[PDB]
C-alpha cells in the first residue's frame, strides 16, 4: 500500500480512488445518489494528497509522536489549502474516527481543519431536488 | 558592503563575523553565524561573496548588500570542514573535511556533475591548490602528504615522518617552493615540480628549518614568494626568507608575565598585495596588524568577545 | 479557535524560511566520462 512506499520516499519525490474505506452506503454525499437523486461528484496531483492526509490521521491514533504528525497536517493545509474541501474526504475521516480511538485533544485537532469549508456540491444538489 | 579595494574579516567562537578596514580600526558590519564555529573563511575570486564553513555546513554570505543571513548554504557532509578554496576563474570549489574526504563542489546551476570525491584513511587538516590550478595537495593526521592531480585519477603519497600530524601546507603563487608544517613545528620545504608542461609532479627534499618548538598551526607564503610566515602555539610567528631561510623577522605577543601561562595561541596570518604588512589573528579575542621591518604593530581590532581562529584578507591584484 | 492560530503561526515563520538557498550533495559524478 501507500504506507510502505511513503516511508521509503518523500512527499515531493513522488510528485516529481484515493479513499480506502469509501463505499456507496456510508458517505455524506454519495449515499444520496440513489435515494435522493444527486449528481455524481466531479474532480493525479490531488489523489496523492488524499493518501498522505489519511495516513497521518491513522498514525495520530497511536499517540506516540503527536507533534510530528500534527505538524505534517498543518503544512498540507498551508501549502494546499483546497485539499480540505471535498465532502468525500471528510466522510472518510469521520468514518475513521468511529472505528479507531483518539485522545480528546487529538480528536479536537481533527474535525477542526474542516470548519472553514463550504461544501458547494451538497448545497447545489440539495437545492435542486428539494425545489 | 564589500565595495572597497581592501577588505578584512575575522571570525571565531563568538558566533559572529566582524568586517574591518585597514585604514582605521573601526568595524563596519556584523553578520550572524549561529550554533557553529568558523574553522576557516575565504572570499570568492569575484569579490562579491565570502565563504565560511564549519561543522557540516558551508554558509555563504553576501558582500554587495547588507544581509545578516547565510543566503547560500551547503549540506551533505557528516563532519567538520577543515578548509575551503576556489578556482582562479571561480568555476569549482574544493573543500576538505574531517570525514577523510577531499571533494570538489560545482558552482554551475546545472547537471554538469563536475564533482570528484577523494578518499583517505585519516582525517585531513589542510587542503592546498597548485598555482596552475591543475593539481591538488591533501594532508591528513597520519603525516602523509598526498599530491592529487586533476588531469588523472592517481595520487602520489609522500610522508616525511609518521606518527606526527601535519596542520598546514601552502604553495607560493610564483611556483618556486612548497612548504608544510606538522604538530612538532618542523617546517619541511620541498622544491616543487619542474615539469610545468606535462605536470610530472616530482618533488625533492630541499631543506628543514628547526623552529616552533611547540605546536605549529599555519604556514603561508607571500604573493611575491619572498617570505614565509609560520604560526605556532608558543604565541610567536616567525617570517622566513627564500634566499637562505634566515630569520627575517620574529614576532611575539607574549606579555612576559608568568601569571598568564599561554593566554592565547597564534592561529593565522595573511600578507598584503605588496608583502609589507601582515595581519595576524590570535586566540586572545583580538587581531593585530604588524609590519615586517619595524616589528611594532600598526592597528588593533577588538570587537570580538570570544577567540578568533580564522581571518580573510585580500585586495586588488595591483600591489 | 486554537488550530487556526497555529495554522497562521506557521505561515508567518514560513515567509522567512524561504530566503536561503540550499544545495545538497547528491552521490553522483562523471564516472562514465
Ligand atoms: Zn463519497
Swiss-Prot record, chain A:
Residues engaged in binding Zn(2+): 22, 27, 30, 88
Entry PTM: Phosphorylated by MTOR; when part of mTORC2.
Top-level taxon of origin: Eukaryota
Protein localization: Cell membrane; Endoplasmic reticulum membrane; Lysosome membrane
Subunit structure of this chain's protein: Component of the mechanistic target of rapamycin complex 2 (mTORC2), consisting in two heterotretramers composed of MTOR, MLST8, RICTOR and MAPKAP1/SIN1. The mTORC2 core complex associates with PRR5/PROTOR1 and/or PRR5L/PROTOR2. Contrary to mTORC1, mTORC2 does not bind to and is not sensitive to FKBP12-rapamycin. Binds directly to MTOR and PRR5 within the TORC2 complex; interaction with MTOR is enhanced by deubiquitination of RICTOR by USP9X. Interaction with MAPKAP1 is not enhanced by RICTOR deubiquitination by USP9X. Interacts with CCDC28B. Interacts with NBN. Interacts with SIK3. (Microbial infection) Interacts with vaccinia virus protein F17; this interaction dysregulates MTOR.
Functional note: Component of the mechanistic target of rapamycin complex 2 (mTORC2), which transduces signals from growth factors to pathways involved in proliferation, cytoskeletal organization, lipogenesis and anabolic output. In response to growth factors, mTORC2 phosphorylates and activates AGC protein kinase family members, including AKT (AKT1, AKT2 and AKT3), PKC (PRKCA, PRKCB and PRKCE) and SGK1. In contrast to mTORC1, mTORC2 is nutrient-insensitive. Within the mTORC2 complex, RICTOR probably acts as a molecular adapter. RICTOR is responsible for the FKBP12-rapamycin-insensitivity of mTORC2.
Homology family: Belongs to the RICTOR family.
The protein's name in its UniProt record: Rapamycin-insensitive companion of mTOR
Source organism of the structure: Homo sapiens
The encoding gene: RICTOR
Boundaries of the shown chain within the full protein: 1479 to 1694 of 1708
Curated annotation (Swiss-Prot), chain B:
Parts of the chain that traverse the membrane: none
GO MF annotation terms: protein serine/threonine kinase activator activity; protein-macromolecule adaptor activity
Annotated effect of mutating residue 313 to S: Impairs interaction with MTOR
PTM entry text: Phosphorylation at Thr-44 by CDK1 promotes ubiquitination by the SCF(FBXW7) complex, followed by degradation.
Crosslink position(s): Glycyl lysine isopeptide (Lys-Gly) (interchain with G-Cter in SUMO3): 79, 208, 238, 254, 298
One Pfam family here: WD40
Cross-linked residues, Glycyl lysine isopeptide (Lys-Gly) (interchain with G-Cter in ubiquitin): 298, 306
Disulfide bridges in this chain: none
InterPro entries: G-protein_beta_WD-40_rep, MLST8, Quinoprotein_ADH-like_sf, WD40/YVTN_repeat-like_dom_sf, WD40_repeat_CS, WD40_rpt
Function, as annotated: Subunit of both mTORC1 and mTORC2, which regulates cell growth and survival in response to nutrient and hormonal signals. mTORC1 is activated in response to growth factors or amino acids. In response to nutrients, mTORC1 is recruited to the lysosome membrane and promotes protein, lipid and nucleotide synthesis by phosphorylating several substrates, such as ribosomal protein S6 kinase (RPS6KB1 and RPS6KB2) and EIF4EBP1 (4E-BP1).
Name of protein: Target of rapamycin complex subunit LST8
Organism, scientific name: Homo sapiens (Human)
Swiss-Prot record, chain C:
Residues with PTM Phosphothreonine: 3
Localization per Swiss-Prot or TrEMBL: Cell membrane; Endoplasmic reticulum membrane; Early endosome membrane; Late endosome membrane
Taxonomy, superkingdom: Eukaryota
Post-translational modification: Phosphorylated at Thr-3 by AKT1 or RPS6KB1 in the presence of growth factors; the effect of this phosphorylation is however unclear. According to two studies, phosphorylation at Thr-3 by AKT1 is part of a positive feedback loop that increases mTORC2 activation.
Tissue spec. comment: Ubiquitously expressed, with highest levels in heart and skeletal muscle.
Disulfide pattern: none
Family affiliation: Belongs to the SIN1 family.
Domain remark from Swiss-Prot or TrEMBL: The CRIM domain forms a ubiquitin-like fold with a characteristic acidic loop, which recognizes and binds AGC protein kinase family members substrates.
Subunit structure: Component of the mechanistic target of rapamycin complex 2 (mTORC2), consisting in two heterotretramers composed of MTOR, MLST8, RICTOR and MAPKAP1/SIN1. The mTORC2 core complex associates with PRR5/PROTOR1 and/or PRR5L/PROTOR2. Contrary to mTORC1, mTORC2 does not bind to and is not sensitive to FKBP12-rapamycin. Interacts with MAP3K2. Interacts with ATF2. Interacts with MAPK8. Interacts with GTP-bound HRAS and KRAS; inhibiting their activity. Interacts with IFNAR2.
Record function comment: Component of the mechanistic target of rapamycin complex 2 (mTORC2), which transduces signals from growth factors to pathways involved in proliferation, cytoskeletal organization, lipogenesis and anabolic output. In response to growth factors, mTORC2 phosphorylates and activates AGC protein kinase family members, including AKT (AKT1, AKT2 and AKT3), PKC (PRKCA, PRKCB and PRKCE) and SGK1. In contrast to mTORC1, mTORC2 is nutrient-insensitive.
Protein name listed in UniProt: Target of rapamycin complex 2 subunit MAPKAP1
Organism field: Homo sapiens
Name of the gene encoding the protein in the UniProt record: MAPKAP1
Parent sequence residues shown: 84 to 116 of 522
Amino acid at each position: 500500500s501507500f504506507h510502505l512506499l511513503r516511508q521509503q520516499m518523500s512527499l515531493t519525490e513522488i510528485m516529481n480512488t484515493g479513499l480506502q474505506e469509501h463505499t456507496d452506503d456510508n458517505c455524506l454525499y454519495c449515499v444520496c445518489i440513489e435515494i435522493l437523486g444527486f449528481q455524481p461528484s466531479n474532480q493525479m496531483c490531488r489523489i496523492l494528497l488524499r493518501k498522505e492526509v489519511l495516513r497521518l490521521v491513522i498514525n495520530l491514533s497511536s499517540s506516540v509522536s503527536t507533534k510530528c504528525h500534527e505538524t505534517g497536517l498543518l503544512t498540507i493545509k498551508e501549502k494546499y489549502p483546497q485539499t480540505f474541501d471535498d465532502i468525500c474526504l471528510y466522510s472518510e475521516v469521520s468514518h475513521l474516527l468511529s472505528h479507531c480511538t483518539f485522545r480528546l485533544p487529538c480528536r479536537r485537532f481533527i474535525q477542526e481543519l474542516f470548519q472553514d469549508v463550504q461544501f458547494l456540491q451538497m448545497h447545489e444538489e440539495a437545492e435542486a431536488v428539494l425545489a | 558592503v564589500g565595495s572597497d579595494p581592501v577588505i578584512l574579516a575575522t571570525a571565531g567562537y563568538d558566533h559572529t563575523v566582524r568586517f574591518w578596514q585597514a585604514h582605521s580600526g573601526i568595524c563596519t558590519r556584523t553578520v550572524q553565524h549561529q550554533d557553529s564555529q568558523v574553522n576557516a573563511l575565504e572570499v570568492t575570486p569575484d569579490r562579491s561573496m565570502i565563504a565560511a564553513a564549519g561543522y557540516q555546513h558551508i554558509r555563504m554570505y553576501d558582500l554587495n548588500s547588507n544581509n545578516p543571513n547565510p543566503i547560500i548554504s551547503y549540506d551533505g557532509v557528516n563532519k567538520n570542514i577543515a578548509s575551503v578554496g576556489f578556482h582562479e576563474d571561480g568555476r569549482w570549489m574544493y573543500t576538505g573535511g574531517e570525514d577523510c574526504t577531499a571533494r570538489i563542489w560545482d558552482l554551475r546551476s546545472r547537471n554538469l556533475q563536475c564533482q570528484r570525491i577523494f578518499q583517505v584513511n585519516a582525517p585531513i587538516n589542510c587542503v592546498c591548490l597548485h598555482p596552475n590550478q591543475a593539481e591538488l595537495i591533501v594532508g591528513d593526521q597520519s603525516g602523509a602528504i598526498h599530491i592529487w592531480d586533476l588531469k588523472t585519477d592517481h595520487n602520489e603519497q609522500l610522508i616525511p615522518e609518521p606518527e606526527v600530524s601535519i596542520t598546514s601546507a601552502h604553495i607560493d603563487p610564483d611556483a618556486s617552493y612548497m612548504a608544510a608544517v606538522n604538530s612538532t613545528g618542523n617546517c619541511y620545504v620541498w622544491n616543487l615540480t619542474g615539469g610545468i608542461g606535462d605536470e610530472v609532479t616530482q618533488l625533492i627534499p630541499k631543506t628543514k628549518i628547526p623552529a616552533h618548538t611547540r605546536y605549529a598551526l599555519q604556514c603561508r607564503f607571500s604573493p611575491d614568494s619572498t617570505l614565509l610566515a609560520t604560526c605556532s602555539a608558543d604565541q610567536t610567528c616567525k617570517i622566513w626568507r627564500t634566499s637562505n631561510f634566515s630569520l627575517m623577522t620574529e614576532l611575539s605577543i607574549k606579555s612576559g608575565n608568568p601569571g598568564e601561562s599561554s593566554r592565547g595561541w597564534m592561529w593565522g596570518c595573511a600578507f598584503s598585495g605588496d608583502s609589507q604588512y601582515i595581519v595576524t589573528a590570535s586566540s586572545d579575542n583580538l587581531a593585530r596588524l604588524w609590519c615586517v621591518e619595524t616589528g611594532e604593530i600598526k592597528r588593533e581590532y577588538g570587537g570580538h568577545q570570544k577567540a578568533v581562529v580564522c581571518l580573510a584578507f585580500n585586495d586588488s591584484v595591483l600591489g | 479557535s486554537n488550530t487556526a492560530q497555529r495554522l497562521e503561526r506557521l505561515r508567518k515563520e514560513r515567509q522567512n524560511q524561504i530566503k536561503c538557498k540550499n544545495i545538497q550533495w547528491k552521490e553522483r559524478n562523471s564516472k562514465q566520462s
